[PDB]
Nucleic acid binder design. Structure first.
Lengths: 126, 133, 136, 150, 180, 37
RNA sequence: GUGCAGUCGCGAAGACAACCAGGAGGUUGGCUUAGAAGCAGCCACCCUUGAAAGAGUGCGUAAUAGCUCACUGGUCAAGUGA
RNA sequence: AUGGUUUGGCACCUCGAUGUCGGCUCGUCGCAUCCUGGGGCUGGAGCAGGUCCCAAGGGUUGGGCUGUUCGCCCAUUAAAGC
């Protein structure tokens, strides 16, 4: 661990958030590498799913276009990013969610808004 | 999850198979026939059949791809896996065989694709003792 | 056990245990070494036991040097005898080891096993000693 | 002599082919044969040591192919250590309990580099069965040098 | 490529002798003698802490600038008397230098890499003596042992010399021996 | 218990302490128990 | 053991410790034993989804499993470690 | 390294006298404990042990051989201490 790598991860989060469009943040619980890798290779040939921090993501947020959130990452963080649109992969994480139920789908930053019953759930499932 | 590269037609020795799954609590005679019935169409397999179970003690299993090490052996002619790579390259394994491994393991391996699977089995053989190129 | 093929004088005065070592104060042969901090006569048995201790703590791999040869005799009068009637005959072969003198040297990949082997050797040795490095 | 090793001559059967103690050419590698002046056909290998001095005698030579599978082997040895103090010198017998071996290149020396050098004979002349015995013979935990002898 | 000549204060020695030297070393200083083509040697008191920092951060053969009573004199570390036991610097022989001097030094050779598992590397030379200008003396002279089988006597002429440096040693000088 | 002047750890669980003026070594494995004496 | 003088690694971009969740496939990487696998024993000591996963930290292990690990993320919260 | 009991080294008091071995009697002390007592670990199931620690309160047999001390042996003993 190094603060140089902290700034590196902040820059990586900022630039990949700018490059890829959909960003589904998740609270990971009830996992296992053997199964998450297996499902991820299948559902993620156009996305990628991995960790985020509570403060490095906040720095990348202040330095990217997701500026004011600052309180969502109080908990485990296993963000995935879809470089097209999280519809197939969003449905994928939705079925994984209704399978395990330990994982929570925190939300995202599709465009301006963070999370609500209106857009994120329905664009994910349907 | 009793992970064992269970062998060909054999009378169930003690170390690898029988009590190996017995200590976890799976039956002793049904699994060999139930797996032979699936390897009829795939005659020739020493698959790492990770023996699995149901709620009330039933034989659940999804047949897996054969092992990369032992498939490399069966394809390299002499069924003998060495132990000293990087210093003595026993025999150069060929790309079509590496890709046949990749194709038969793309079903039931955690590889991304053909070339990722090839790199995975490359590391496998790199630890093993045999060339992969 | 080390021993010379010959000595011009078999019966010699005891080597003077004084002064800091002027030569062999550094490594010049390997990477890690044993430096002495006390004066002492180091013998064949001590040298061989320490060499062996190194060669057992670590095996094939690396090299060992012994920068001292015990070419200095030490006599012993017979037991149950009076003082006088001549000087005793040589019994022990030692090397006069002043402080600073590097005694054992080795080159081995892992500093951990090297230092531990040298520690085994030092515990075989009769003196307070020290690990030293070619680097500084 | 002429029962197992030698049945590969192209010209005509009948053999006085002997495997000179130069490189152990019994494995099916690029080899040739020199009509040994008084003593038959010394069969030698391409990467042999005393091959240039034989090619200096360039007339007394003849083609050979040498794939007579049902025969014996010349044999090759390996460098492996012992320890000499009450353990890991009887590991040679522990690991010879799983393999029988004839003496090739043994040598005991311990005022040396940091081991009781006990360069170990072997009875293994197979292409694809080397690392196996080299693992069986590698109990001492200080196995750094592993290459065979030529 | 150059090297920033490290800065140091150097009070001149008033009383010279073993008593003064020992009192200085107890005061944390270092006796030194600056000589060279200056041809009028100066007897100085460095500071042990910063002098040792300079040496351990820029090797022995280090350029350095000496605030000798205001004057900033350029010098090289020619030799060191270090105690065997304490390993404290007892004395520094320093060489006056200037721009484009082509001094001669004894630089630290450093092996690195890793050969075949079935071998061993023995350094026969702690150092290599070279000629170079006294602002581009390398802190180190590296050599590689990646992919070198036994029987590879790496000598001094086989080293990767930088620009301007010139071997004064012989190429026959064995540096590294790769053995079983 | 072992009572020796040289008491030291034997495994990673062996912890060293100074109890009642005596250097003790404690562990889950009571074989590794030691005391300075 | 304690004091002093340092030095180095890390650290509010949350460190070390604790508490919550996860902690691998390939794969048994190979030899060896009736076996060899994260762990009689040994050779090499890889790659891959990916944060993190060690040719596995150990236990448990007849081999396995289960157990917790190293490690990853979090909750509080600055000293912490060598 | 301890101890100072062995063989010794030194030759410091004692050669105008310091009587010697062994035994008998009388004891006294130390603990480096033979038994008894307390305890830790154990490759301690239990009986019985091994090893280490604490412990000197008391007890620690009678006989054959030998001048013998010592030792061997006989029977015993909780034990037959140094």
């Amino acid at each position: 661990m190094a603060k140089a790598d902290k700034a590196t991860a902040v820059a990586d989060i900022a630039e990949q958030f700018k490059a890829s469009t959909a960003t589904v943040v998740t609270e990971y619980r009830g996992l296992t590498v053997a199964n998450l890798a297996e499902l991820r290779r299948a559902l993620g040939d156009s996305a990628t799913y991995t960790v985020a921090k509570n403060t490095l993501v906040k720095r990348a947020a202040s330095e990217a276009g997701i500026e004011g959130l600052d309180e969502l990452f109080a908990g485990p963080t296993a963000i995935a990013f879809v470089k097209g649109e999280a519809v197939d992969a969003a449905k994928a994480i939705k079925k994984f969610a209704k399978d395990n139920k330990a994982l929570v789908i925190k939300g995202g930053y599709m465009d301006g808004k963070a999370l609500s019953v209106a857009d994120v759930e329905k664009i994910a499932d349907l | 999850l009793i992970k064992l590269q269970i062998q060909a037609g054999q009378a169930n020795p003690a170390p690898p198979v029988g009590p190996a799954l017995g200590q976890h609590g799976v039956n002793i005679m049904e699994f060999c026939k139930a797996y032979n019935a699936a390897t009829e169409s795939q005659r020739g397999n020493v698959i790492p059949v990770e023996i699995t179970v149901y709620e009330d003690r039933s034989f659940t299993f999804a047949l897996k791809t054969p092992p990369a090490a032992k498939l490399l052996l069966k394809a390299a002619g002499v069924q003998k896996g060495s132990g000293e790579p990087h210093k003595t390259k026993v025999a150069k394994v060929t790309w079509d065989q590496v890709r046949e491994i990749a194709e038969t393991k793309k079903a039931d391996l955690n590889a991304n694709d053909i070339d990722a699977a090839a790199k995975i089995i490359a590391g496998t053989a790199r630890s093993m003792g045999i060339t992969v190129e | 056990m080390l021993i010379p093929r010959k000595v011009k004088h078999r019966k010699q005065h005891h080597p003077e245990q004084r002064g800091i070592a002027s030569g062999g104060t550094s490594v010049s042969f390997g990477d890690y070494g044993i430096q002495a901090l006390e004066h002492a006569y180091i013998t064949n048995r001590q040298i061989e036991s320490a060499r062996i201790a190194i060669n057992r703590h670590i095996k094939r791999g690396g090299k060992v040097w012994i920068n001292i040869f015990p070419d200095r005799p030490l006599t012993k009068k017979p037991a149950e005898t009076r003082m006088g009637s001549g000087k005793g005959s040589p019994e022990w072969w030692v090397a006069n080891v002043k402080p600073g003198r590097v005694l054992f040297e080795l080159s081995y990949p892992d500093e951990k096993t090297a230092r531990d082997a040298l520690t085994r050797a030092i515990h075989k040795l009769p003196i307070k000693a020290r690990i030293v490095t070619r680097e500084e | 002599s002429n029962d197992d090793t030698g049945v590969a001559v192209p010209g005509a059967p009948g053999v006085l082919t002997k495997l000179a103690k130069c490189c152990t050419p019994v494995p099916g590698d690029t080899i040739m044969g020199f009509v040994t002046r008084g003593g038959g056909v010394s069969v030698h290998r391409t990467d042999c040591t005393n091959a240039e001095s034989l090619q200096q005698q360039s007339e007394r030579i003849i083609e050979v192919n040498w794939a007579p599978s049902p025969s014996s082997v010349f044999l090759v040895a390996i460098q492996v250590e012992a320890l000499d103090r009450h353990r890991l010198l009887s590991d040679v017998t522990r690991v010879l309990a799983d393999e029988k071996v004839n003496i090739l290149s043994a040598s005991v020396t311990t005022s040396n580099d940091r081991v009781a050098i006990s360069r170990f004979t072997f009875e293994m002349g197979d292409p694809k069965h080397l690392g196996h015995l080299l693992s069986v013979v590698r109990n001492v935990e200080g196995v750094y040098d592993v290459y065979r002898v030529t | 490529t150059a090297n920033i000549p490290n800065k140091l204060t150097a009070n001149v020695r008033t009383r010279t002798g073993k008593g003064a030297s020992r009192q200085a070393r107890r005061d944390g200083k270092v006796p030194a003698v600056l000589y060279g083509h200056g041809t009028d040697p100066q007897h100085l008191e460095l500071n042990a802490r910063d002098f040792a920092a300079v040496l351990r951060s820029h090797g022995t053969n280090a350029i350095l600038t000496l605030d000798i009573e205001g004057t900033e004199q350029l010098a090289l570390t020619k030799a060191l008397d270090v105690h065997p036991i304490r390993r404290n610097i007892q004395h520094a022989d320093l060489l006056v230098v200037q721009r484009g001097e082509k001094v001669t030094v004894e630089v630290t050779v450093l092996v690195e890499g890793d050969a075949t598992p079935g071998t061993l590397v023995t350094q026969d030379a702690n150092t290599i003596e070279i000629e170079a200008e006294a602002l581009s003396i390398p802190e180190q002279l590296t050599v590689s042992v990646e992919g070198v089988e036994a029987g590879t006597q790496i000598t001094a002429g086989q080293i990767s010399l930088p620009e301007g440096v010139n071997l004064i040693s012989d190429p026959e000088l064995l540096v590294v021996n790769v053995v079983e | 218990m072992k009572v020796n002047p040289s008491v030291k750890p034997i495994c990673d669980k062996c912890r060293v302490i100074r109890r009642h003026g005596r250097v003790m070594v404690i562990c889950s494995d009571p074989r590794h128990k030691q005391r300075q004496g």
